[PDB]
C-alpha cells in the first residue's frame, strides 16, 4: 500500500467520535488514530493550496471546561453550583501564579457531576502510567536527566502539589469534597492533566471579551510542531472553537495535522509543562563564555538562511541542489553563537580561523563534562523498550542536548571550507 504517516498506526474505537457526535461535535476531513504514543489526528483527503482557511474541527462550548484569567472568577460552562464548598478552595489561590491548581479542582468536580461529558471522556485521557509529565517522576528519573536546575524545579513543583492536598483535603472536610480526591495521587493526576492539556485564548461570549484558560476536548489530540499546519479560532456566534488549516498550504493524504503549543520557548519549558523534548528547537540556547566571534552575515550566506533576525528561514529555491543539513538546529545556532558584524568591511579569512577553533574548544569541553557520550545514550534507550515513560524522556533530553552541541561542531567546520571558495 501507499506509505503514509498514518499507515503505521491503527484506527481508534468508533466510540471516541460517537460520544462527541451526539452532542454537536463535527469533524471534517479528518481521522483519528492511535499508536504507542497515544492518539493523533491525521488527514483523509487532499487539499490544494487554498485562498482562505478551512475548518477541520468544530467543538461546542458546553463540552469544554473554562476559567477566566483575572480576579472575578467566571466559569463559562458554569458547572459549579452557588454555595458549594469547592469555590472556597478555588478562591484561595494566588491570582497570578497558580492557574494550574484552579483548573485541577474544576476537573475533579466534573468527574463527580452527572451528565457531564467529562465523566465519559476521561476514560480516554492518559492514565498514571501513560502520562509523561514529570510531576509524576521518582528520584531516580530526576537524577538521570543530568541537570541540576531542571531537577530542582521539578521537586519544588512536586511539593507545591502535595501541600495543597494536605491543606484543603484535611479530616474535617465535608464528604462532597473528600470524595473528589481521597488519595494524593489523584490530585497529582489532575494537575498533570491541566498543565499538559491547557490552552489559553481570548473568548467573547455575548458582549464580554475575556481572556481565559481552558481545557478543550478533541483538540488536545493535536501534536506540536514548529512548522505548523493548523491554528485555533473562536467563532462567537455559535459559541464554538474552530481548528483550522493555514492558508496557502498543500496537505496530502495521510499527513499529520499539527499545532504549535508555545512560541519562542526553550526545551527546559517543554519538559516542565509537557515532558517532551525536540532535537530541533529553533530557539534553544547553548552558552559560550568564550570571547571569540564569527561574522554574522557570512554565516547566513553559506547556509542560505534568509530573513530578519527574529525570523530566520532557509530559502530552498536558492538551494537548488537538494540539501538537508540545514535544519532547525543550524537556525538555532545562528542566534546563539556570539557574532561580530561591523559596517560592511569583509572578514579576514585567517583572522576568523582562530575563532573557529577557540569556539570548538569550548564545545569539546562541554561534551566531556557529562557522564556519558551520545552513542552510549542511544544504547541505554535501545536496551529497554518498555520502561517508565518518564525515564525514556529523561534519557532523550540528554541525547538531544548533546546532539545539538555536536551539530554545532560539524557546522562551524563547514563554514571554514566555504569561506574560501
Amino acid at each position: 500500500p501507499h506509505d503514509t504517516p498514518a499507515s503505521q498506526l491503527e484506527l481508534a474505537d468508533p466510540d471516541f467520535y460517537k460520544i462527541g457526535y451526539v452532542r454537536s461535535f463535527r469533524a471534517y476531513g479528518i481521522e483519528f488514530r492511535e499508536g504507542p504514543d497515544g492518539y493523533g489526528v491525521f488527514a483523509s483527503r487532499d487539499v490544494e493550496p487554498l485562498r482562505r482557511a478551512r475548518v477541520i474541527m468544530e467543538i461546542p462550548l458546553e463540552l469544554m471546561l473554562t476559567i477566566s484569567k483575572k480576579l472575578p472568577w467566571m466559569f463559562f460552562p458554569d458547572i459549579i453550583p452557588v454555595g458549594h464548598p469547592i469555590f472556597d478552595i478555588i478562591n484561595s489561590t494566588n491570582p497570578e501564579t497558580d492557574s494550574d491548581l484552579r483548573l485541577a479542582c474544576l476537573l475533579l468536580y466534573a468527574f463527580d457531576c452527572k451528565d457531564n461529558f467529562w465523566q465519559l471522556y476521561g476514560d480516554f485521557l492518559p492514565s498514571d502510567d501513560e502520562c509523561t509529565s514529570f510531576l509524576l517522576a521518582t528520584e531516580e528519573d530526576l537524577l538521570e536527566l543530568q541537570d541540576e536546575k531542571l531537577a530542582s524545579t521539578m521537586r519544588e513543583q512536586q511539593q507545591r502539589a502535595l501541600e495543597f492536598w494536605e491543606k484543603n483535603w484535611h479530616s474535617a472536610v465535608p464528604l462532597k469534597i473528600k470524595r473528589l480526591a481521597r488519595d494524593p495521587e489523584r490530585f497529582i493526576w489532575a494537575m498533570c492533566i491541566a498543565q499538559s492539556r491547557s490552552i489559553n485564548l481570548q473568548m467573547r461570549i455575548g458582549a464580554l471579551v475575556q481572556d481565559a484558560n481552558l481545557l478543550v476536548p478533541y483538540a488536545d489530540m493535536m501534536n506540536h510542531s514548529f512548522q505548523p499546519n493548523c491554528f485555533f479560532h473562536w467563532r462567537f456566534k455559535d459559541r464554538m472553537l474552530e481548528v483550522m488549516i493555514n492558508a496557502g498550504q498543500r496537505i496530502r493524504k495521510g499527513d499529520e495535522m499539527t499545532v504549535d503549543y508555545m512560541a519562542g520557548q526553550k526545551n527546559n519549558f517543554f519538559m516542565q509543562r509537557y515532558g517532551f523534548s525536540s532535537p530541533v528547537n529553533p530557539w534553544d540556547v547553548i552558552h559560550f563564555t568564550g570571547d571569540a566571534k564569527i561574522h554574522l552575515d557570512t554565516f547566513l550566506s553559506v547556509f542560505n538562511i534568509s530573513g530578519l533576525p527574529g525570523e530566520y528561514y532557509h530559502n530552498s529555491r536558492l538551494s537548488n541542489d537538494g540539501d538537508s543539513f540545514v535544519d532547525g538546529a543550524i537556525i538555532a545556532a545562528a542566534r546563539t553563537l556570539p557574532t561580530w558584524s561591523d559596517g560592511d568591511l569583509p572578514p579576514i579569512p585567517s583572522l576568523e580561523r582562530k575563532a573557529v577553533k577557540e569556539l570548538q574548544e569550548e564545545c569539546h569541553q562541554m561534551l566531556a563534562e557529562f557522564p556519558t557520550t551520545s552513542d552510549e545514550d542511544q544504547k541505554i534507550l535501545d536496551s529497554m523498550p518498555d520502561c517508565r515513560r518518564t525515564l525514556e524522556a529523561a534519557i532523550k533530553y540528554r541525547l538531544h542536548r548533546k546532539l545539538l552541541i555536536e551539530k554545532v561542531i560539524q557546522a562551524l567546520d563547514i563554514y571554514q571550507d566555504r569561506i574560501l571558495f
Binding site: 547566513l300 534568509s306 530559502n315 569583509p346 579569512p349
Partner: protein, 192 residues
Amino acid sequence: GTEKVLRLVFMEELMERARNADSKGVSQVIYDMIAAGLSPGPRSFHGFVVSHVLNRDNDGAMHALRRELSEGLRPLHETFLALVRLFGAKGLATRGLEILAAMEKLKYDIRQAWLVLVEELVRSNHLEDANKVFLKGAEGGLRATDEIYDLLIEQDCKVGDHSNALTIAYEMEAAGRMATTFHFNCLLSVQA
C-alpha cells in the same frame, strides 16, 4: 589539499587590501587569479565590490558587478546589499530600485534590503523618494518594521506633509499594527 593551501593563502591578501580600500590592488590579485588558474569565485569578487564601495565609486562597484555577472556566477547576497546602501546615500533611487528587481529574479528575499534603502534615504535627506519607495513596497505586500513606520510618520509631519503621513498610517493599520497616541499627535501638528 594543495589547492586549499593556496586558495587560502591568496585570499588573505585580497582581504588585506579590501579593508584598506585599494580597489586597484585587488584588480591585480584578480588578474593574478586567472594566472594561477585559481578559479574565479563569487566570494573573491566580493572583495572587489567592497573596495569601490568603501570609496563611493558607483561606476566601479557596478563595473565589478558587470564582470561577475558576465562570468555567470549568481552574486552573493551581501554584495548586492552594500550597493544598495551606497546608492541610497546618493539619492539614486531609481537605480537602487533597479538592483532590487534583479535580486528578486535570482530568487532572493528582498524584504531586508528594501528597509535599508528607505532608512538611509531619510538620513541622507531625500524624503520624497523614501516615501515613494515605501509605498511601492507596501503594495507588493512587503511588511515593515515598527521603527521604520514611526520614522516616516514623524519626519513627514515635521516638514509638513500630511498627505504622505496619513497614507502610511493607514497602511500600518492594514498590515496589523494599530495607532497609538504618538502617531495621532504628530498628525495633529499639521492639522492645527
